[PDB]
Design a binder for this molecule. Structure first.
Ligand code: 1WU
Ligand code: 1WU
Lengths: 388, 388
């Protein structure tokens, strides 16, 4: 009778208070309908709790506590908004995820690992999450705002020297090492999910595709997860069932990354997905540099090191072999202190709501149909709420 | 964001932790069925919480923490058991209430007031409740054990003098005054629900029929609640709709009580319910003493005082008029100290599990059918769990 309390005090546990509240709240949201209320038990339940649940809901953190400055990103499950918290006037980034879409597109569990990583990493490479909350429509995540934009934007606005590539890649390595050391594989590494902070130092951003490893160091996965241009071949083949893979796959991607950075296009680019896949599987005979784009011998090697079968891939036998590859030899920074050194491009920013390093998003509302019997659409999202 | 915590810390509140747990637990109990688990959302929910809920359930207080010494009472919703708590070896009385029967007989909300009264009265006249807990089958209430039995038993085993009647009635008065002062009407006063403690002093026992009063001091009730022999006529007539009644009705019953005690039969006894009702409505011309049973002039008056219309009933204008009625004049005790004086009959008891003052109960299992859709049978019982 003494453990239990600590169970509920524990911020990491699924039956800590906020989750329990999520419970009453999601239960109520999922039972309060005229059709279901024809059931006495459901009716006489709601009469008891419908009131205090509303009150609770008010005391909670809510979307209206924040001003929305501007939408800095948008995708198929929601948006990311620049915001300012009213009472404190502090600026944040806030990710909205449509509960309606997640149910519809049957993809309603990809955020747990994102939650816990951002909540608990306590790492300079992992964008921090301060609060996680929700309402009948969305999930919200309040994050430290990374004002530097992403590496896509940098590469879109720069011909990148190696001196720089050596830096950013280095930082990607340490970042991926942190996640790996937490027992997780990133699975969707790419400049898109690499954000530069106020000083121009990377943090990994989107973790919707993360997965925990075995006591060994592997994942049994039967679905391909990732983004065509950067998917490694071990992960592509896993699709066809019985796939047993590990962290090596992220290093593949770190590979493509550096190619993209230096050469200027992706190393398996195509006019199609089939044309990207089929060519990634032929990585042996398909990877090739332009003569004109003269990348160095050391840089050339690091790429090919990553771009090969998993059994021979740089990183197969530790991160150490990666770190001490000679392409990372330089005067500017050591691996002890890279993130406290003067990054290649420091963001010019006017104010705490300067979002110039992000593109302008357009702006151009769909909710669940009323149920006739109990379907339980809010059940997937119980345990999501989190307070610093 | 600061109130809320205190809300949940508050033992009186419905969203205090135990209730929240009751929530997850009852949700799980009501969703874990093959039929419903064909619903993805319900399935993928249970997979997350089914495990820790079981663990929680183990850490909880449970029926197996108690030995069952013997069944000291049984009725249509359950039993009352003498018990001993294993770890502490302390004896208690424990009331079981069948969840299955309460759903079936559509009477699943009569225990809340019983819970709170016994939990929170902090009164010598109100049997104390130490813990309230539950499982898929029953509700359990762990109470201080009243080893003296009830006043039915005493009257069954004694020709009662007035000196005694003056005492017990007195104690009933103070007891009913306490409940009244808590904003509640008892509605089922009768010796059955009067238990003598170790020293032979009354406490009121069953509160399944209690009701809170208005800011005025009344109850709007359209159902007759009580037990034929002791129902007052105002409450009988309330049945026929539009009944507005108050605490006076308990004093009616305190009336019958004293009659039963002194004369030896109930003052509206019959071979039937119709014969009991119809005769209670004629209380004007129907109440009458036996000449042989010579009750005193003062005692005679107190009865008739209670046994009359509500508008003229002793107690209509306060408890004071009751207290200083001359039938209560005596040398033994004052109203300041009655309960610390030497009761009329002190229980002879051999051990802490002596239940000689209770009858032997026989002993001669019916649970819910598996649901096909969500019905919510555990919803009525969310918020019942309580720990000292
Ligand atoms: N897979 C593409 C992607 C990249 C980044 C995403 O999230 C963001 C976007 C922008 C910012 C942040 C987080 B953040 O913490 O500061 C600014 C995001 F939601 C999706
Ligand atoms: N309406 C009849 C009735 C009377 C008393 C009831 O409960 C009991 C019975 C016996 C005991 C207790 C409580 B208790 O706290 O000590 C002994 C009870 F459950 C029903």
């Amino acid at each position: 009778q003494r453990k239990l309390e600590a169970l509920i005090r524990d911020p990491r546990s699924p039956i800590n208070v906020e989750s329990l509240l999520d419970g009453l709240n999601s239960l109520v949201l999922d039972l309060d309908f005229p059709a279901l209320r024809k059931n006495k038990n459901i009716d006489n339940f709601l009469n008891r709790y419908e009131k205090i649940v509303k009150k609770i809901r008010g005391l909670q953190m809510k979307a209206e506590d924040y001003d929305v400055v501007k939408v800095i990103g948008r995708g198929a499950f929601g948006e990311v908004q620049l915001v300012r918290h009213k009472a404190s006037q502090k600026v944040y980034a806030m990710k909205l995820l449509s509960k309606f879409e997640m149910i519809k597109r049957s993809d309603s569990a990809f955020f747990w690992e994102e939650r816990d990583i951002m909540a608990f990493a306590n790492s300079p490479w992992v964008v921090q999450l301060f609060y996680a909350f929700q309402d009948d429509r969305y999930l919200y995540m309040v994050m430290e705002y990374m004002p530097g934009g992403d590496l896509v934007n940098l590469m879109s606005n720069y011909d990148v020297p190696e001196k720089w590539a050596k830096f950013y890649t280095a930082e990607v390595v340490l970042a991926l090492d942190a996640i790996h050391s937490m027992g997780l594989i990133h699975r969707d590494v790419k400049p898109d999910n690499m954000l530069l902070d106020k000083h121009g130092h990377l943090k990994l951003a989107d973790f919707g595709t993360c997965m925990k490893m075995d006591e060994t160091g592997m994942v049994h996965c039967d679905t391909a997860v990732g983004t065509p241009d950067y998917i490694s071949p071990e992960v592509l083949k896993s699709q066809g069932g019985d796939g047993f893979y590990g962290r090596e796959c992220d290093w593949w991607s770190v590979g493509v990354f550096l190619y993209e950075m230096l050469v200027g296009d992706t190393p398996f680019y195509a006019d199609s997905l089939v044309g990207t896949y089929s060519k990634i599987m032929d990585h042996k005979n398909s990877l090739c540099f332009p003569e004109d784009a003269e990348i160095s011998k050391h840089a050339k090697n690091l790429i090919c090191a990553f771009l090969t079968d998993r059994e021979v891939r740089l990183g197969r036998n530790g991160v150490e072999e990666i770190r001490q590859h000679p392409f990372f030899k330089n005067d500017q920074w050591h691996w002890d202190n890279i993130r406290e050194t003067a990054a290649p491009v420091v963001p010019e920013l006017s104010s705490d709501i300067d979002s110039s390093n992000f593109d302008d998003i357009e702006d151009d509302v769909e909710t669940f149909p009323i149920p006739k019997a109990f379907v339980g659409n809010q059940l997937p999202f119980i345990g999501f709420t989190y307070y610093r």
